[PDB]
Structure 1
């Protein structure tokens, strides 16, 4: 029921769009912005902030401001990428009971999906405000190269935000839909290069015309889910730290407030250098010595920046080679190169991509909104409102199992179209344990473990010829479902999953409840503000009452009202709701009383 909204859930920024009849439309949030910072904050006085208001206070509240959670979602605490971030992020990353990467704020342990849910809730309310009705269904995006755990965790985030996730869509696939909607963009093969704040994807996509309908088929995809603008910032931040150290003999790294200011300045400097050739990093009072306060002032040329990050850019080119190889195409077969993501605005990035493909990328694709638009289009394909549009996507990673010898044995190859199904007999009745992994490496140890899937034996029985057949389904969301049955009896076999990543049903239900309690807490927190606004109205009117009385007002009555006015003003300067309400009440009584005497 209701509209299926399309939500680009980004590492850095999020964006929501709808189908406006036949045309997709990106919606402005309450702040009037077409994108929303993927930032969640908890204030000292216990408030939860999302988007711009959260971003604004990060500099003074670095420990309790959560950002880039998409780089933790669906990951394990002991993951190399996470272990590195543990030392870098200003907030506290911890291990959950099952070993998953979680965060801790003010003693409270939280799962990444709970945090991302807060962003999704804001995108949901954005759509609801615009539409004037409830929204309960959504298409949510994920990087094409997201693995099973990352996908499911993102889907879980949608549920926690109160959204039925009708489809998890791969981000380059969404961008392709947006690009291809334009009549006259058909029968061509495109390369979608998406470099965002956290992840990098490359997809090769064929747009065709079959039976009057436009078809989109992903031929191959590749990338790196932990390669993005955050990493460019980090290179620049480290440089600035080192230069200040050499210059002023002070190491800013143990100073949380300094490092937060530096992070902000570094990203601004990076962004400036996409258009200017030099930028100035200025941070007055960045620290203090026994000698007095110190100020950071350092010029950074584009040349310097490029030397600090060139290898990151080069890291994005290698998957391009694999994607083309997997697609069975050469650059010459690519009709259009499409850039998506804010980090593609870097001249070096554009130049490297153009040089690789031997052609200039298109300029007529919105790098901030194409993904959300495509998500909305996908929604409209689901609701039947978008006609003559079909898509066929793939799974990005080989699905395999660890077999005797510690080897990775592939069951479903990367770039297989989805949904897809593979069935195999694993046992003639004995108990079975299946170690399922995703990746292309030859050794199981070098791939991503999804878990151990255990089946009990089937007991011997006259005329029983047990054949335990295990089926591996990958759905339209790109998510695995393992089931089993005895072909001989047709009886379903229960699978017990051990050592897997992710939230269980009980946790999810609790986190759904917790999100609702947060919303209730938010409405509560608002009470004070509402009361403050009422106080200002009351002050405004009662001051007019004094003025209108002029001299007709007795000294004692005038003294009383003026005392009540000042007392309310003082209370409003404070944070005590009871005191404010009490002073409003007393002012109202004095106003009423004088009114009555005036009438006398």
Structure 2
């Protein structure tokens, strides 16, 4: 009944609701306001999401998935995906359509299903707080996400059983959260979002013209594979090389050692944001027949800064590009808003302050603002939030491949959305049966250097001289940033059937199958939980009966006492197994014969 806003981050996910006019973040079952984006599949069949999954990471590395957002919407042969293939403990494979999928327990799974598991946990948290079913949600994506990644995120939302009312850019959500309390003074802001895996920069104007707060995204830019994971990778590489120099062992050959080192590097990087120096201590990191080996290496803040300065500087150029696109300068930015945990690093804050010449505001929560803005967006869609208007832009220039492999723009970057373009297309061959259009996204002048959306084939063209048929093709960009291509004959008005080929993404049948699979996974998790509860009850009953035997057993007649010695073992026989109902039946017979010892 109530639309919830979900920040679906690479490392941490958050959920918020509109409690009347007040946005409110909800805490998960563990008590945390944010949920780590870690999904674990147990052999028992329990699906673990968040902190518990992280706890089991050391014991189930192959079936524990994380950083799935870095794979969503990407093809397997991408350089980033190929780099991640040799690093992630879980198996990354190519799908039948060439997209990057994961392999868990011998089953191929698309990243949308895995993200849908986290979305299901957030949905369950929202329902537990509200006590009513939730079927509608607003889901966040990085501003610089291309069409394929946005579509895959919407598919993940659908698989989780949520009607995705709106896909909202994370900097836009932060802008909504900030504009809720201080959007009234006609202020231009720069939202600098640096999360676990993605970086975005948005120049956004906020004005109170005639009593309605309007948020207009003047410009946007970023990098979808730049984030705290790369900082951790730099630190891990330094630590591995130093350990190999000190002890001669390359830890890259030990997956468990690499997992522990990833955890230690994450903790050290976080601690260096407050401390000037930390010590990475990983005792018993590995063991040879000579004995255990221990890692103990000092890391100063200067060392980490020297290791990640180039990444921080890589984040700076999109600021210049966005400022040029907006037609403004650093003096024309009234407020600087930092978003994301990685901005807590003092080097990032110093670099941003030096770039803009002014210190960023301290009144914005970097971990919760995105979910608050998503909840605000949901409230706007229902009318619960009034006097608020939004005008976002397309992050990438849409174009087509023309003669010579050159890119031909149809919709420029930073064009406000929703938007509609129409262009006339015709045949290049006599009596041509079909006309193909290669559609791509990117700013590069060469078609081969842009993200291909695919070949759209207008097929079934009646024979005619080349250039005679006149097909108007319309490219629509909805409020989600997703492209929809349509075609109609401008002479007759009849629609032309478009067949998409060589595109990335999931089809409808796959999505339905994955929804059913998600339901099956939920039922398997409940069965595993019921079994766990049954084992706890059985152990409690066994201990209680032993206590009763110790206190009163000797007074009890020998016949029942001697019989129950093995009768309790009969209950144990089922208790050691994977039986839920028979454990209860044996528990019932044991309790009925222990009744005399109960009272």
Q: TM-score, normalised by structure 1?
A: 0.95
Aligned: 1:570 with 2:569? no
Cα deviations by residue, 1:353-379 (Å, 9 ceiling, x for unpaired): 010000111111000000000000000
Q: Is 1:186–1:214's contact at 8 Å kept on the other side of the alignment?
A: no
Q: Is 1:464–1:488's contact at 8 Å kept on the other side of the alignment?
A: no
> Which stretch of the first structure deviates more once superposed, 174-183 or 39-48?
39-48
Q: 1:430 to 1:208 in 2, by over 3 A?
A: farther
SS in 2 for 1:492: coil
Q: Is 1:179–1:185's contact at 8 Å kept on the other side of the alignment?
A: no
Q: Is 2:45–2:525's contact at 8 Å kept on the other side of the alignment?
A: no
**Residue equivalent to 1:398:** 397
Quote the Cα distance in structure 2 between the aligned partners of 1:249 and 1:551. Answer: 64
Give, in angstroms, the shift of residue 537 of structure 1. Answer: 5.0
Cα deviations by residue, 1:136-170 (Å, 9 ceiling, x for unpaired): 00000000000000000000000000000000000
Q: 1:462 to 1:355 in 2, by over 3 A?
A: closer
Quote the Cα distance in structure 1 between the aligned partners of 2:6 and 2:182. Answer: 24
Cα deviations by residue, 1:57-79 (Å, 9 ceiling, x for unpaired): 11222221100000000000001
Name structure 1 gaps, 5 residues minimum. none
Name structure 2 gaps, 5 residues minimum. 427-431
> Which stretch of the first structure deviates more once superposed, 116-125 or 517-526?
517-526
CA RMSD in angstroms, aligned pairs only: 2.2
Q: Is 2:44–2:528's contact at 8 Å kept on the other side of the alignment?
A: no
Q: 1:184 to 1:138 in 2, by over 3 A?
A: closer
Q: 1:554 to 1:82 in 2, by over 3 A?
A: same
> Which stretch of the first structure deviates more once superposed, 318-327 or 287-296?
287-296
Q: 1:595 to 1:439 in 2, by over 3 A?
A: closer
SS in 1 for 2:202: strand
Q: Is 1:137–1:164's contact at 8 Å kept on the other side of the alignment?
A: yes
Q: Is 1:180–1:186's contact at 8 Å kept on the other side of the alignment?
A: no
> Which stretch of the first structure deviates more once superposed, 54-63 or 545-554?
545-554
Q: Is 1:244–1:250's contact at 8 Å kept on the other side of the alignment?
A: yes
Q: 1:176 to 1:525 in 2, by over 3 A?
A: same
Q: Is 1:39–1:50's contact at 8 Å kept on the other side of the alignment?
A: yes
Give, in angstroms, the shift of residue 517 of structure 1. Answer: 0.5
> Which stretch of the first structure deviates more once superposed, 568-577 or 10-19?
568-577
Give, in angstroms, the shift of residue 535 of structure 1. Answer: 2.1
Give, in angstroms, the shift of residue 553 of structure 1. Answer: 2.1
**Residue equivalent to 2:429:** none
Cα deviations by residue, 1:377-416 (Å, 9 ceiling, x for unpaired): 0000000110000000000000000000100000000000
Q: 1:511 to 1:488 in 2, by over 3 A?
A: same
Quote the Cα distance in structure 2 between the aligned partners of 1:83 and 1:463. Answer: 43
Q: 1:248 to 1:575 in 2, by over 3 A?
A: farther
Q: Is 1:432–1:457's contact at 8 Å kept on the other side of the alignment?
A: no
Give, in angstroms, the shift of residue 546 of structure 1. Answer: 4.9
Quote the Cα distance in structure 2 between the aligned partners of 1:97 and 1:180. Answer: 45
Q: 1:263 to 1:462 in 2, by over 3 A?
A: closer
1:184-333 superposed matches below 5 A: 185-333=184-332
Q: Is 1:557–1:594's contact at 8 Å kept on the other side of the alignment?
A: no
Give, in angstroms, the shift of residue 595 of structure 1. Answer: 6.9
SS in 1 for 2:295: strand
Counting matched residue pairs gives 594
Quote the Cα distance in structure 1 between the aligned partners of 2:587 and 2:463. Answer: 82
Give, in angstroms, the shift of residue 556 of structure 1. Answer: 2.9
Cα deviations by residue, 1:272-296 (Å, 9 ceiling, x for unpaired): 0010011111111111233221111
Q: 1:555 to 1:228 in 2, by over 3 A?
A: same
Give, in angstroms, the shift of residue 550 of structure 1. Answer: 6.6
Cα deviations by residue, 1:144-197 (Å, 9 ceiling, x for unpaired): 000000000000000000000000000000000001101565410000000000
Q: Is 1:466–1:487's contact at 8 Å kept on the other side of the alignment?
A: no
Give, in angstroms, the shift of residue 524 of structure 1. Answer: 1.2
Give, in angstroms, the shift of residue 509 of structure 1. Answer: 0.4
Q: TM-score, normalised by structure 2?
A: 0.95
Quote the Cα distance in structure 2 between the aligned partners of 1:534 and 1:46. Answer: 20
Quote the Cα distance in structure 2 between the aligned partners of 1:290 and 1:534. Answer: 44
Give, in angstroms, the shift of residue 583 of structure 1. Answer: 4.2
Q: 1:324 to 1:289 in 2, by over 3 A?
A: same
